[PDB]
């Protein structure tokens, strides 16, 4: 009787997991259909408005709270919040890709980094909401100079008493707004996972490494080390996180999914504002444990020596830092980790078929860091959370 009371409750949860269910199910069933390469573009639609939508809130939720959050925080507080996130983000990472070269081995570079350097710095804001750099200014938001110029923005707020406060304030009311907006987009979601997935599907032993990886990581790692840290129940915290992991499935961005995994720990796991604006847009670009795992396992698997293999564990978790919250980062970092061993670059052609399906699991794992991340640093931050009250 008592699941009369769940279906009622869970409504959207359920409707985009039956959306994944009905998804999968007419992909497969309109796949031997042949189309044309437009014709898939045209059937995937009711998907692509759900990126534009997740895609349209992006800008003023990354912008709007870190320059509030950090401004509500002491600068030495932030600091302190700060060494949380970077320790707890390395230490992640690190665990992974030592994870990673386990289950393997049992089953233009410098502009790269120049190119990163610049995006860091950008030499006009207006510009930085909607191109990045690319050796010259590529299409595409420079999520990565809004985070950083944001933070720099937020602690200069905070340093400038009650003179900063209405710039604070005028922040706050738009990140809200913002958030606001998200209630919306979340309603069509199931509809549009649903054709953001069956068109993808309209389209070896690697796969299953890597798959089996996630699963090892994101299920038993990850939670083991968020009821070490904070003793409550970490199972229950993913159930919260739910409808942004299946956005993450659906989208294969941690950037498009970033609104969705605000509106769910904001609410759902009831996770303080004040961290969640800390941890979550910085998470959603450097921490990224799953694609971690992936530069590591494609890394050795392209290879079918242990100081080269003490570099790859280096440069994957350096990659993995790098690499956009965008959709196919992944594979065009690969170059990085490719170059640094002495592995033709060439060899990534190989993985680009499969990769489609293995980027939509890595970006749960991606966003599941940065959801268990702020669980964690909200438990350990508590004393300044508890003075600013
Ligand atoms: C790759 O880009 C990043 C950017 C930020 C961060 C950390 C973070 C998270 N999560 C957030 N929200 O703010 C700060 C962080 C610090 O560790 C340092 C911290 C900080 C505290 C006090 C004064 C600062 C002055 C300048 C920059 C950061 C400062 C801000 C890590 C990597
Ligand atoms: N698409 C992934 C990044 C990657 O491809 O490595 C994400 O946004 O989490
Ligand atoms: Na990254």
């Known amino acids: 009787e008592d699941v009369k009371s769940f279906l009622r409750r869970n409504a959207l949860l359920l409707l985009t997991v039956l959306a994944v269910i009905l998804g999968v199910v007419l992909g497969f069933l309109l796949r031997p259909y042949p189309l044309s390469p437009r014709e898939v573009k045209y059937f995937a639609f009711p998907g692509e408005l759900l990126m534009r939508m997740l895609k349209m ?9 870190l320059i509030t959050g950090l401004a509500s925080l002491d600068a030495k507080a932030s600091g302190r919040l700060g060494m949380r996130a970077v320790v707890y983000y390395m230490s992640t990472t690190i665990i ?19 190119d990163l350097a610049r995006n860091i710095f950008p030499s006009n804001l207006v510009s930085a909401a909607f191109r990045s750099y690319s050796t010259q200014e590529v299409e595409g938001m420079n999520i990565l100079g809004l985070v950083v110029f944001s933070i720099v ?4 707020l905070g340093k400038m008493g009650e003179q900063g406060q209405l710039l604070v304030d005028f922040f706050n009311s738009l990140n809200e707004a913002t958030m606001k907006l998200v209630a919306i987009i979340m309603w069509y979601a199931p509809l549009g996972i649903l054709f953001l997935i069956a068109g993808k599907i309209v389209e070896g032993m690697y796969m299953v490494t890597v798959i089996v990886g996630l699963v090892i990581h994101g299920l038993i790692v990850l939670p083991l080390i968020y009821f070490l840290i904070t003793r409550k129940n970490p199972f229950v915290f993913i159930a919260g996180i739910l409808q942004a992991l ?14 969705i995994t605000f509106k769910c720990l904001e609410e759902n796991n009831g996770v303080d504002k004040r961290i969640t604006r ?15 795992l992936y530069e590591a396992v494609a890394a050795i ?5 242990f100081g080269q293999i003490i570099t790859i564990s280096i440069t994957a978790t350096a990659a993995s830092i790098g690499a956009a919250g965008i959709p196919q980062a992944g594979l ?9 061993v002495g592995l ?11 990769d489609w399906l293995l980027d939509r699991f890595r970006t749960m794992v991606n966003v599941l860091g940065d959801a268990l991340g702020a669980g964690i640093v909200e438990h350990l931050s508590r004393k300044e959370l508890e003075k600013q009250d």
């Open 246 to 259: 299946i956005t993450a499935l659906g989208t294969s961005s941690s950037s498009a999914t970033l609104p």
């Open 153 to 156: 923005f937020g602690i200069a």
């Open 278 to 292: 800390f941890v979550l847009p910085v998470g959603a670009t450097i921490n990224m444990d799953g694609t971690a």
């Open 301 to 305: 698997f392209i290879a079918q020596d």
């Open 344 to 354: 033709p670059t060439d060899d990534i052609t190989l993985i680009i078929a499969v």
């Open 57 to 65: 809130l992006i800008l003023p939720l990354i912008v709007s709270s």
């Open 332 to 340: 065009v970092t690969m170059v990085i980790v490719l170059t640094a």
């Open 96 to 114: 992974a890709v030592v994870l990673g070269i386990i289950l393997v081995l049992i089953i233009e570079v410098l502009d790269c980094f120049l």
